[PDB]
Design a protein around this ligand. Structure first.
Ligand SMILES: Nc1ncnc2c1ncn2[C@@H]1O[C@H](COP(=O)(O)OP(N)(=O)O)[C@@H](O)[C@H]1O
Ligand SMILES: *[C@@H]1[C@@H](C(=O)OC(C)(C)C)C(=O)CC[C@@]1(Cc1ccccc1)C(=O)OC
Length: 338
């Protein structure tokens, strides 16, 4: 079997000429050559079966990405694993090869307004499809937005997704109702994340950083100002509402004071995405029709999912052995003789 940095990478003979790209907590990603289709691919080695949480995320990612088909969402081309469940210790997910992600890009590039608009449109175009399938991504952030060699943006990493029904490292893109531990979240939490990403494209700085939720919440309240009673009522948690009502008053910082050189249309849409009240937060289809994106907006070319999930997976209490069986069955379509 082929080897990369002393690690087994058992994807031959179809996939060869592996090159290390990076690694996460329980896997390694390489580029490779598909000798059968004569194309360059990415291959993610996943080894999740010793931890229930990794199995959860692996199953969700596979189930969702296999059911999605959209230009602005990463696809799965192939999945390699052992022919018997007892021998399956790793799963190799073959994907289109991307060149970078928005996180790395913002480390070195100050984007022009035109390119910010281009990226934002592609994010929202993909998000519209995701939400039409009744799915919340729940982990949108620059590092989960990949770009290929022709500058096409694809949303990736659906391991934290859920079907909509009202332990990550980077929490700077999470909506305030999550920090406040509100009862039921909606599609609006993804819109907030997109607002955070837009702000970071305009300045190359996170807009709401912080060491913890309390700190991050203060950053948010310092920019948006103190919420009104109408807004507070959307926080189901009574303790969170009492807390907020006890804080000193904060005035709203005008967006042009923070982003003095940004397109005023971009700031108007930013305002609608980063509203405290999730019920008043702009929706994906409304964001696409905002004047800031009028150069790109084309509903006839912005497709939706054929059949939404509306099928809460309910994996949170399944033992990792049950989850491994589900992952075995879900990957069986890539096995000869299925
Ligand atoms: N389809 C892909 N093409 C090219 N590079 C890819 C890719 N999917 C992931 N990568 C890269 O491989 C590295 C690890 O990816 P990942 O498995 O998702 O780890 P993580 N902790 O970022 O969530 C990242 O640098 C990521 O950009
Ligand atoms: C492409 C994008 C980019 O980094 O592309 C790769 C191939 C990943 C290096 C950007 O950084 C900005 C947008 C992009 C495509 C583009 C070109 C002209 C007009 C609009 C969009 C680019 O090449 O910017 C210079």
């Amino acid at each position: 079997p082929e080897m990369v940095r002393g690690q087994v990478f058992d994807v031959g003979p179809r996939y060869t000429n592996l090159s290390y790209i990076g690694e996460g907590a329980y896997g390694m990603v390489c580029s490779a050559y598909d000798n059968v289709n004569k194309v360059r691919v990415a291959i993610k080695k996943i080894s999740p079966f010793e931890h229930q949480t990794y199995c959860q995320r692996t199953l969700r990612e596979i189930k969702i990405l296999l059911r999605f088909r959209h230009e602005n969402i990463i696809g799965i081309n192939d999945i390699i694993r052992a022919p018997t469940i007892e021998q399956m210790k790793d799963v190799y997910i073959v994907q289109d090869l991307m060149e970078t992600d928005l996180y790395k890009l913002l480390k070195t590039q100050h984007l022009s307004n035109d390119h910010i608009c281009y990226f934002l449109y592609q994010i929202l175009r993909g998000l519209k499809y995701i939400h039409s399938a009744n799915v919340l991504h729940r982990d949108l952030k620059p590092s989960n937005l990949l770009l290929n060699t022709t500058c096409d943006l694809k949303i990736c990493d659906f391991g934290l997704a859920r079907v909509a029904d009202p332990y990550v490292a980077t929490r700077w893109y999470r909506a305030p109702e999550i920090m406040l531990n509100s009862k039921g979240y909606t599609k609006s939490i993804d819109i907030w994340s997109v607002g955070c990403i837009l702000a970071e494209m305009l300045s190359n700085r996170p807009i709401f950083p912080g060491k913890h939720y309390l700190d991050q919440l203060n950053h948010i309240l310092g920019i948006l100002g103190s919420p009104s009673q109408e807004d507070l009522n959307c926080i189901i948690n009574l303790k969170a509402r009492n807390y907020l009502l006890s804080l000193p008053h904060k005035n709203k910082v005008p967006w042009n004071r923070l982003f003095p050189n940004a397109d005023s249309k971009a700031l108007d849409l930013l305002d609608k995405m980063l509203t405290f009240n999730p019920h008043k937060r702009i929706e994906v289809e409304q964001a696409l029709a905002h004047p800031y994106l009028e150069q790109y907006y084309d509903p006839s070319d912005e497709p939706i999912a054929e059949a939404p999930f509306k099928f809460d997976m309910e994996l949170d209490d399944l033992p990792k052995e049950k989850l491994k069986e589900l992952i075995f069955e879900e990957t069986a379509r890539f096995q000869p003789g299925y």
